[PDB]
Paper text:
The trimeric [name]-1 envelope glycoprotein ([name]) spikes that mediate virus entry into cells are vulnerable to at least six distinct epitope classes of broadly neutralizing antibodies (bnAbs), where each bnAb class is a major focus for vaccine design. [name] and its more mature lineage member, [name].12, utilize VH1-46, neutralize 18% and 90%, respectively, of a multi-clade panel of 199 [name]-pseudotyped viruses, and do not require insertions or deletions for this neutralizing activity. The inferred unmutated common ancestor (UCA) of the [name]/[name].12 lineage, referred to here as [name] UCA2, exhibits micromolar affinity binding and weak neutralizing activity against an early autologous [name] [name] that differs from the transmitted-founder (TF) [name] by a single [name] change, suggesting that this variant (also called M5) initiated the lineage. Here we used virus neutralization to identify two point mutations and a modified glycan profile that together render [name]-1 [name] [name]-pseudotyped virus highly susceptible to neutralization by a germline-reverted form of the [name] lineage of CD4 binding site ([name]) bnAbs.
To understand the structural basis for [name] UCA2 recognition of [name] with the [name] and [name] mutations, we determined the structure of [name] UCA2 in complex with [name]-enriched stabilized CH505TF.[name].[name].[name].664 by cryogenic electron microscopy (cryo-EM). 3D refinement of the ab initio model against the cleaned-up stack of particles, without applying symmetry, confirmed three Fabs bound to the [name]-1 [name], following which 3-fold symmetry was applied to obtain the final reconstruction which refined to an overall resolution of 4.2 Å. The [name] UCA2 Fab bound at the CD4 binding site, approaching each protomer at an angle similar to what was previously observed for structures of other [name] lineage antibodies bound to monomeric gp120. The [name] UCA2 Fab used its CDR H2 to mediate key contacts with the gp120 CD4 binding loop, exhibiting the CD4 mimicry that is typical of the VRC01 and [name]/8ANC131 classes of [name] antibodies derived from the VH1-2 and VH1-46 heavy chain germline genes, respectively. The [name] UCA2 also made extensive contacts with loop D and loop V5, which are the sites of the [name] and the [name] mutations, respectively. The side chain of gp120 K279 adopted an extended conformation that allowed it to stack against the side chain of N93 in the [name] UCA2 CDR L3 and form a van der Waals contact with the side chain of gp120 F353. The [name] UCA2 CDR L3 appeared locked in place by its interactions with loop D and loop V5, with UCA W94 sequestered by cation-pi and pi-stacking interactions mediated by loop V5 residues R456 and Y458. Apart from interacting with the CDR L3, the side chain of the engineered gp120 Y458 also stacked against the CDR H2 of [name] UCA2. A change in conformation was observed in loop V5 to accommodate the bulky tyrosine side chain from the [name] substitution.
Numbering used by the authors:
A (entry chain Z), B (entry chain J), C (entry chain F): 518 to 548, 570 to 664
D (entry chain C): 1 to 52, 52A, 53 to 61
E (entry chain A): 32 to 147, 157 to 309, 312 to 321, 321A, 322 to 359, 361 to 398, 409 to 504
F (entry chain E): 163 to 210
G (entry chain E): 309, 312 to 321, 321A, 322 to 357
The structure:
Amino acid sequence: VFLGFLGAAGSTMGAASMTLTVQARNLLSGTVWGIKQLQARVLAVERYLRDQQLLGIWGCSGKLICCTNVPWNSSWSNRNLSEIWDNMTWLQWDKEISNYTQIIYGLLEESQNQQEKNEQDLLALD
Amino acid sequence: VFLGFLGAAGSTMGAASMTLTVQARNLLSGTVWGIKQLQARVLAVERYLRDQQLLGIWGCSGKLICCTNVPWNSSWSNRNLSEIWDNMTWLQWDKEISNYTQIIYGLLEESQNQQEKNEQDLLALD
Amino acid sequence: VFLGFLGAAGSTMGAASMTLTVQARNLLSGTVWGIKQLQARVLAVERYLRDQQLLGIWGCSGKLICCTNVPWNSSWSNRNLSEIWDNMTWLQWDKEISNYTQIIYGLLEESQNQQEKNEQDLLALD
Amino acid sequence: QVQLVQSGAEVKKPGASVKVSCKASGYTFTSYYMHWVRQAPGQGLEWMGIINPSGGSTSYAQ
Amino acid sequence: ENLWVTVYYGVPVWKEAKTTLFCASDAKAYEKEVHNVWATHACVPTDPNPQEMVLKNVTENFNMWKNDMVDQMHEDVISLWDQSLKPCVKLTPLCVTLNCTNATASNSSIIEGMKNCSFNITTELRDKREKKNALFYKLDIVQLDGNSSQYRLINCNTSVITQACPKVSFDPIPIHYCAPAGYAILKCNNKTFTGTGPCNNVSTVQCTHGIKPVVSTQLLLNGSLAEGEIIIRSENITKNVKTIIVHLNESVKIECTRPNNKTRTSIRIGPGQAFYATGQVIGDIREAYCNINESKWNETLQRVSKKLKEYFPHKNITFQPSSGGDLEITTHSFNCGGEFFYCNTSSLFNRTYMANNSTRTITIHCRIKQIINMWQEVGRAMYAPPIAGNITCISNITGLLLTRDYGKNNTETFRPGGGNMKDNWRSELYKYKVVKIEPLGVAPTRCKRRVV
Amino acid sequence: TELRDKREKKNALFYKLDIVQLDGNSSQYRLINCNTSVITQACPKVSF
Amino acid sequence: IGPGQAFYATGQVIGDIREAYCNINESKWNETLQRVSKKLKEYFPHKN
């Protein structure tokens, strides 16, 4: 089934994660005015790679869903989410936490670098 | 040794897998008519990324050889392959199973999504 | 903090590895003369992918720092490095070992292929 | 560098006609509307009309 | 409790954005090897499939006055018209003093300036010239500022006039638009949508339907119809607005014709160049005209008035005819048959309304012109060869472009407007918005990562 | 100018370093570079 | 010249005649060159 993009979209997070592979894959599908066709294609590629590299920097290069060790806290958004996780959903969530993405990403980088150092020391002691 | 592409090619699968790193790497090596040089280079890049992303979707982003948990069955091609694995070889194999690639890929996606869910539940219960 | 590139640069290796994520990420940031803007952007992308693929060939696709099993030897550069590791530093190091990069890379490929074969046999025997 | 330039005029006899004009630059001429207004010493302001230089048509106060 | 950061990739979240959209076309090629059409539209991937996905519980805001795609339609239309004259002969050698006496004219519509207009042309060898003559329509011929017996082409002392190649004659080709990867186009499925505010029925497509590059003033023709009743779209900040767009839910058929029959002639210029002009005219004389059904015209305007008063909910409504300006803004302009028509529509908007089919044909009179200063540019005039024989043309009327003016009393006054080509395209692109997708984001979860 | 059919006698001032004597009668003059190359003018808008 | 073309040239000249010229301060010109000479002789460390 080709759901294109933004198929769900109106759904709960539950539930919405079921199509992460759809949006991940439909993202790579692409007289002097033709110069713009090439420019648009170059932009699509560069943007893809920047996000893929960032997942690698955070230690999540191989996954659509990735669990890490930066703790969640209340200096950020403030929701218990016992019901709201499955009732909000995504657009509203990003707006609610829109003032923290530049903060969280910084924590993710620090956490991954610490883990890499710990791995190197443990292997060195082998 | 630069074997270029399709060096073996006439060999058994045995045997043929010995050069997977050759074909994997030689694949990235690339007045108004010059617009076509850029178009050709863009196409080579986009095609590479689409295949690399797909291996990631199936859980095999880091490997040339990858083992998964979709069972083989007889609704697909029908060969015992005790000898034929090492006597066929690749061109003939793809022709024999040419009617199933659009089926197998669907199974690979389902298998990987199930494993990712299982990992998240196991970590959540930690 | 945006350190751009080559921030340290004059430092010991110690110490210098602390910014590997900086140089890794600042590397992807990009009338007929405009044809050159597209050509330059295509070159930046192709060069990035070639290095990323090579780390994958050696088994280090997900890491900035990667430990492998090719032994170090004296047929290459000759330094004890007990102090020099943290006193040389990088430009001088590459010059000292400039005659061996075409050798070491060959060893890295062989080591990774052997490990992949060993994994397949161990899984097959499961 | 947006500028408007106007010429002067004489005193006319009752029943006579007068022509006045305005030149303008620093912005594309055909990209905007122009207005004319009138005020006499000791009086308030009145709107007279609008002209669209792009085409064009006009509209005037009754 | 014990929440940790988790990261997801492939989240269905989007933002408004400015981008570049690309054309898409129909399955059938132009097939004339024309750079501005065959290589511009016929070599464009064809038949995109609009497999619309309807989204449950999605609300989005659609602003049709301000968006980022109407301007692209405008630029694409201009680009084609400039390229279409690229390989075609310039008429510079024709800008010579003309001697047109109209001695043989048989009608008042002719004798003003058309018959046997003569000139001295050097051709084909540079060494020799001959006296030639041809017929030109009167609206394009002006008196030389000298003796009244001397004439000049209307635009040749200020700009370049070029002719068109038969192969580049351009009729409408519907153009479909598609987003580049990472972008999506949203439609607003609301039959009563007026161009502003939220829509509670949102769906997405990989392509829009085709929109034809049709240019007109006063009346909107060949377009789609409103699903329900007549919808009048306007701005809601101040009442001093430039354009009122009336979209009908029923078409009115208009039939037009140019009843005479013309002979085409050709004056050689040089090695692959010739000037086309009118030769002998057949055979009696009738003026060009258009036919409108009376009951449909009157019913349609009564229904428009009923809805128009919603924006002006007070006194009555009066319509008026064109007040002034050049012909494109005062007449109904169209290009049936490849020739340009300027019809007098002043008889059609003289109705008044107040608070509390194939019969009685309404006819209007039309004129034609050959040298056109197109809406797209200045300084580069396009000429047009005559089309031999007569011209017949049938099209559908889907809407009106109205403006407002001062009445003589306390009622509202409306009249036909136009010239803003963007208001034609904006009348079909009102349904689309383009957004970008940003798939990466974070959320809390009851999960920690193993160190080992 | 402007109609190809008619011509007029015009005159203007040019600076002396750009005017050369025609290789003939001394009363006749030529633009300094026009017998060997193309001379173009500049648009006011491109003054740089 | 034609339909969007014209040649620009000089018309009446006003109104008396003076040659074009440039003004330089004397002490700065002389001091500057003396300092240049002082450094130039480093490359040519011999005669004047």
